[PDB]
From Swiss-Prot:
Location(s) in or outside the cell: Virion
Lineage: Viruses, Riboviria, Orthornavirae, Lenarviricota, Leviviricetes
Full-sequence portion shown in this chain: 2 to 133 of 329
Remarks, miscellaneous: This protein is translated as a fusion protein by episodic readthrough of the termination codon at the end of the capsid protein.
Highest taxon, organism lineage: Viruses
Organism listed in the record: Escherichia virus Qbeta
Gene Ontology molecular functions: structural molecule activity
Name this protein carries in UniProt: Minor capsid protein A1
GO cellular component terms attached to this protein's record: viral capsid
Coiled coil: none
Record has Disulfide bond as a keyword: no
Keyword annotations: Capsid protein, Virion
Function, as annotated: Minor capsid protein.
Length: 268
């Protein structure tokens, strides 16, 4: 509910870098909290924005929006002062209903945090090897330990094939009815021609079943939709990319996003 200074450790490939995000206050025009570093020039600032949207007459859902930027400073050979040659965005969005409790919300946040540490994405984010690749990705049953509210749940996502039409992968639960699978899709498809950038997309589809006396057959409710999208350009090194992925994992364990996700409190 109240902003503080957020400190994230073991960031990067080596897990030795550390980031301190000083809060820069809550913009009340669009209700977006903002956190940045201290670098005394606004261009060279790693910015993190968190916003929580109430359900409206149009939206009719809860929606949490997390964006993060990471500019890169060059020498600027002719000039004296350094400029921003490129920046690496990353955007996370969540979707929930009012009937969705916190434990489903806390499940998604912890599953997403453990998913970024998984060997599938660190091949997909750093090396840019898509899941849709005989020799690019392992494409094996990913086990996600210690997720949940108390961190005592474990998830195994079985690879239910790769769709070549959209290029996306699919990592589903090992359940029976196809409407009840907790299917996670990773799309590392990289259109470098029209977008001139690299897009990585993950959807933690996390459906929920609660039905009785409906002819003794369960029905999907809410579905706990979640989405993550990365944006990198050419010439961006993988350590710049691995810096983004690792600090995204650190924010999902951060107390500023615990109450923002679980209790849905906008941290003013």
């Amino acid at each position: 509910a109240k902003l503080e200074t957020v400190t994230l450790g073991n960031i990067g490939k080596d897990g030795k870098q550390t980031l301190v995000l000083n809060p820069r206050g809550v913009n009340p025009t669009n209700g977006v909290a903002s956190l940045s570093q201290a670098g005394a020039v606004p261009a060279l600032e790693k910015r993190v924005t968190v916003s929580v949207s109430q359900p409206s007459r149009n939206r009719k859902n809860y929606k949490v929006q997390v964006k993060i930027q990471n500019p890169t400073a060059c020498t600027a050979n002719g000039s004296c002062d350094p400029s921003v040659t490129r920046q690496a965005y990353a955007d996370v969005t969540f979707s929930f209903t009012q009937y969705s409790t916190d434990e489903e919300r806390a499940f998604v946040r912890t599953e997403l945090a453990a998913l970024l540490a998984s060997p599938l994405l660190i091949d997909a984010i750093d090396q840019l090897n898509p899941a849709y690749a005989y020799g690019g990705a392992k494409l094996e049953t990913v086990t996600l330990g210690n997720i949940g509210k108390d961190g005592k749940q474990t998830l195994v996502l079985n690879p239910r094939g790769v769709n070549p039409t959209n290029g996306v992968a699919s990592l589903s639960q090992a359940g029976a009815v196809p409407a009840l699978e907790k299917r996670v899709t990773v799309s590392v498809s990289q259109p470098s021609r029209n977008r001139k950038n690299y897009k990585v997309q993950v959807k933690i589809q996390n459906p929920t079943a609660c039905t009785a006396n409906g002819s003794c057959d369960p029905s999907v409710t809410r579905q706990a939709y979640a989405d993550v999208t990365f944006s990198f350009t050419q010439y961006s090194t993988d350590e710049e990319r691995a810096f983004v992925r690792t600090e995204l994992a650190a924010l999902l364990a951060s107390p500023l996003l615990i109450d923002a996700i679980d209790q849905l409190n906008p941290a003013y």
